[PDB]
Amino acid sequence: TRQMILAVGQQGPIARAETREQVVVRLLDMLTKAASRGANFIVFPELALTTFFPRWHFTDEAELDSFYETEMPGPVVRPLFEKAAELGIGFNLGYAELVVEGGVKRRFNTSILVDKSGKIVGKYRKIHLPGHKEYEAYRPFQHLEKRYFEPGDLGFPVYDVDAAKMGMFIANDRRWPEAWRVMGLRGAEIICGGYNTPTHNPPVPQHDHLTSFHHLLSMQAGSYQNGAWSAAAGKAGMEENCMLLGHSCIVAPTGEIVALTTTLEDEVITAAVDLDRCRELREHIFNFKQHRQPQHYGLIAEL
Amino acid sequence: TRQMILAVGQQGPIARAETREQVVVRLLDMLTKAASRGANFIVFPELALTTFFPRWHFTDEAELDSFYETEMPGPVVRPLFEKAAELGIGFNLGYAELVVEGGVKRRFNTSILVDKSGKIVGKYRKIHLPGHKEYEAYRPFQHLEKRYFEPGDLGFPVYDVDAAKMGMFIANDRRWPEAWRVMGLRGAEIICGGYNTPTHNPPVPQHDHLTSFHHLLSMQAGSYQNGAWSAAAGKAGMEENCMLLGHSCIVAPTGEIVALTTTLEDEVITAAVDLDRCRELREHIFNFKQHRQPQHYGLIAEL
Amino acid sequence: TRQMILAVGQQGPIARAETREQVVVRLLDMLTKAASRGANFIVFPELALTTFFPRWHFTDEAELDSFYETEMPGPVVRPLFEKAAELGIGFNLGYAELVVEGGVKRRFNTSILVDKSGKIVGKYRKIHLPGHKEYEAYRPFQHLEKRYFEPGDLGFPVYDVDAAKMGMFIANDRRWPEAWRVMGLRGAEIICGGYNTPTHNPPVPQHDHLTSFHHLLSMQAGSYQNGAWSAAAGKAGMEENCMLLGHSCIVAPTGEIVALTTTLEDEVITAAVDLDRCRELREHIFNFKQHRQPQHYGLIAEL
Amino acid sequence: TRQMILAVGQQGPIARAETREQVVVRLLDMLTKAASRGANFIVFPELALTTFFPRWHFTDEAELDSFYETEMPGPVVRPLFEKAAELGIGFNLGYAELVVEGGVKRRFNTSILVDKSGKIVGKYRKIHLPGHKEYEAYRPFQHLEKRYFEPGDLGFPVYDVDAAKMGMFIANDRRWPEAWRVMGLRGAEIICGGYNTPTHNPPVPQHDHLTSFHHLLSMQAGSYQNGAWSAAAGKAGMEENCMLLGHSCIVAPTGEIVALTTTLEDEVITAAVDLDRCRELREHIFNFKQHRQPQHYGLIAEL
Numbered sequence A, B, C, D: 001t002r003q004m005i006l007a008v009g010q011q012g013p014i015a016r017a018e019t020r021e022q023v024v025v026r027l028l029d030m031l032t033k034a035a036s037r038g039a040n041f042i043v044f045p046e047l048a049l050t051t052f053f054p055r056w057h058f059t060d061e062a063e064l065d066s067f068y069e070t071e072m073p074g075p076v077v078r079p080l081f082e083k084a085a086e087l088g089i090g091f092n093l094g095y096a097e098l099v100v101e102g103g104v105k106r107r108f109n110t111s112i113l114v115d116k117s118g119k120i121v122g123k124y125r126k127i128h129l130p131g132h133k134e135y136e137a138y139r140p141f142q143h144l145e146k147r148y149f150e151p152g153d154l155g156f157p158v159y160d161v162d163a164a165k166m167g168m169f170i171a172n173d174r175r176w177p178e179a180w181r182v183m184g185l186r187g188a189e190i191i192c193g194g195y196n197t198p199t200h201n202p203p204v205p206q207h208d209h210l211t212s213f214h215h216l217l218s219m220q221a222g223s224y225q226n227g228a229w230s231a232a233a234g235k236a237g238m239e240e241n242c243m244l245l246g247h248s249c250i251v252a253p254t255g256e257i258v259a260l261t262t263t264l265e266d267e268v269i270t271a272a273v274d275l276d277r278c279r280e281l282r283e284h285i286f287n288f289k290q291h292r293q294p295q296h297y298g299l300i301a302e303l
């Protein structure tokens, strides 16, 4: 039957002074609650271990580095992995990754897939970085992702997580059809990730009231056109004076939203998932092999 | 000159024996009404000169050929072009194209762009052909496009139509992000086309109640993610005992539906279009040059 | 905290020859699955024990009567109540009620609320009967609810079901704001019911493609304007050659759909429910006592 | 004569010191453009002659009074009426009404219907006043409508405007089914009005991202359940540092949105209206006389 129960663990705000230990307690509670409701996997938000630090311009590099993980998992996060293995529930965790390679301090906006045995099965590094690189005074709050992270270097992989083929996306990635399609072409049955999406956009404020719409539209369209179940976990609420979007969701291969959060705090939602459901699209209206004419899509891949 | 009024001329059913002369009378009426309401361009349906013949299994090539145009325009369709020039309103007309090359017949599901001077300024040939190849006895109506048409050989071009950069899609094409993206990368400000979409799908009837949803979801996502205005003109209603989807629409570059038809007969809808609105997406959240990482999209173009 | 887990048990078709015993097996499976996922209450469809008989014109009264329950519960349905008490999960069951009073054979389209102790806490009889009274040859299938049922005589009550105030609606009732408002004025925190909604409407077929839209619009609007959680359980799929609408759902007091079914078969969905959530609407934007001016609504109650 | 073209003239912000003469220039422009595109009636916003003054806590009655109209029309607004008669296009204008009766001041949030001859044919006074009564220090902006306006005393009338039966609602009124229903029971074919809806709500900010949703949900449900065309004209944009909702719209009696504004400035949208379309709902699924059971709706009218 190839069935499972997918869950999404939305997070309420994470204060700048909130410790990773405190955040892990909140993550543990949601993972535990999810498991008790039958979930075999739970998706957590992007950069789920800290406040969304890209909203500030840092002058002290040591301060910036404090928001990154140099180990995964480290002693502080270890408990989450142990509980995942115990209860047999995998998860997708987003965090800031700092790794020194060949004399370079590399920083990535990262996410990992952990199976029901508590083992890291795959990693993904955010490829589409939104925002800017330099401080901009006209903004009530910054979004320096291009300053704090370099574009991911692992491409868009699809991993075998227990019985499912899963692909990861991180926040802004969900808005790019290329990210979805590459993973769709790689057979992803589930495409999931998290996000920190302020409901106010300094550059184009006239789209503020469409924040929920644009988020859900991207999730629904991606799922439908690739015949993939999808899930998006947001960190929402008023975090350090910046309102973040909620509406975390789980979407069927038809693009139908099957589960949606309604609060702006830590919230768990679940939905029954039949991996064979993807066939309704992938063996018919979106039977890639039978319908696609790649000879005409060259421009999409031009450098 | 960055302002204009776009119109969609949805068609009601076209009977198997309804003549092109009769159909041209209907098209003339809609183009004339669109112009009277300020429109400078009107989008018509896919295969807008005949009934949707791909629903039948033909056994006589002469009968099949009767539904194709050997010239564009011929004496029968010429009046539409003359009226377009007269009133200063261009149009997108879909039709079945039959070409004879050195004794070889080429068949395409085609659409053309005509400017406000009544001159053909661009052509497109359906690349994504839906349906099946052989007669399937269980179906109340067939969908043999793969047998009656060859996949388009013009790619997804974008043409200058008066003061706008316009790209064309034909029916099923609207569900493929690759089609939208290629035209998006080519700077299309308006992406338009028509469609004949039965509200019943024999192989996957469990999606029948989602026909409107999938159609609108595709139009909205495509527009939003490419920062393009879009329009889709359907031929709707009970045509030869098969119910076709209505909900013809005009969409803003934000993915917002600005105009929608509510009947299943010939119906004109219009909407004010500012070509500079595209910038809200294309110079920011979807600033292609600044955010895309094409080195990771290669799989999309692999044959 | 006043929290609970609400569930909806959508039904696939029920054949005319399917026995109540067989249907009870299907109901038991969904109630059991719901309970295992934490649900404390599950909503079942309207007339959930038989095929939707109003689609046929009966000449034999004995045949018609066979579709009605003269006992509730009877030996056949007893198991459902016993399992509800055992697992501590209440339910809303719809069925055809036949009762002889004062020499009259009374027929109602009925629904009951059963608490987690397996006890019937309240009854409701469908007040808004759609359809017609006499056979109509132009219809591919009838909808003789006005012939087979008399309008409910219990008004729109709200009952205490365990820790929640619950109101019942039956199918067509969900489209009437009066039904929702009366129960809203009676403090309902949850408003639930089921439905058999063909996706084809003989009288006004031009609305067929809007069947899902009209259903969800009614559920969403009712919940929002009354600050009530709501749930609708449909019996969907191809039942005796008539396609019935799916999209069973659970909706928050804000009108946000939090759970939705995607198949057309027996399907269980659940959602976490916080009864205090109603306050976000009922103590503010929809604070009835502070905002309503009943002196101007008289016409709504005029006979 | 059952056909017409309805228009909505959405307004951008109106500054505190912006004069009525300047505002009339803006209204004239929209009414003129609507007429040039075929409209015979244009709906304008609630309190369309001034900034939304209820956002402030007034301490000087003379200052408060300055935002009200003592006559309608006065010399300043007269030009709009003359142009309406000239071009043959009626309108719905919202404004603050100040009436002096035997030394007693009466204050109302009012709207009037003017026909294509420039004659006032109907008035309505906002019955559902949102917000609070006293100054609340924590709010970035107040909403003291309950202090500056008395609930309307004209009920929810329906007037003959040229060839259409039209009913009026004002802002918050659109969220109350009782308002729509009374006009529905009175045969309204078009129910219209305007609004000033901040995208931020101080007491319940957790619904901020749902502002568009709740607005459109109310318009769609109201239209559908009363089989009425509807239109809502908002005054949108950043007005005096408070962001107001846009998404002005025209809706079919099916609840389908046929036209929607996408900017936050003065914007005209139009849509073809067939008054007989109402029959699709009112002579069938919502045939009031045949389906309603008012003897059970009594609680709705109880004082």
Ligand SMILES: NC(=O)N[C@H](Cc1ccccc1)C(=O)O
Binding pocket: A046, A130, A131, A143, A170, A171, A172, A173, A175, A195, A196, A197, A198, A201, B285
């Ligand atoms: N975390 C993250 O990527 N957030 C962005 C929000 C954003 C949009 C546009 C410009 C800047 C920032 C998102 O795409 O959801």
Ligand SMILES: NC(=O)N[C@H](Cc1ccccc1)C(=O)O
Binding pocket: A285, B046, B130, B131, B143, B170, B171, B172, B173, B175, B195, B196, B197, B198, B201
């Ligand atoms: N004309 C056209 O392309 N019609 C198809 C409908 C379709 C879908 C799937 C299978 C067969 C046919 C469309 O994509 O709108």
Ligand SMILES: NC(=O)N[C@H](Cc1ccccc1)C(=O)O
Binding pocket: C046, C130, C131, C143, C170, C171, C172, C173, C175, C195, C196, C197, C198, C201, D285
């Ligand atoms: N069971 C039930 O009430 N079904 C009706 C479907 C219907 C609509 C209109 C006319 C006739 C029948 C419903 O309102 O969902």
Ligand SMILES: NC(=O)N[C@H](Cc1ccccc1)C(=O)O
Binding pocket: C285, D046, D130, D131, D143, D170, D171, D172, D173, D175, D195, D196, D197, D198, D201
């Ligand atoms: N002008 C107007 O009525 N505005 C209100 C917005 C509102 C809601 C709730 C509380 C306060 C204010 C509206 O209902 O659209």
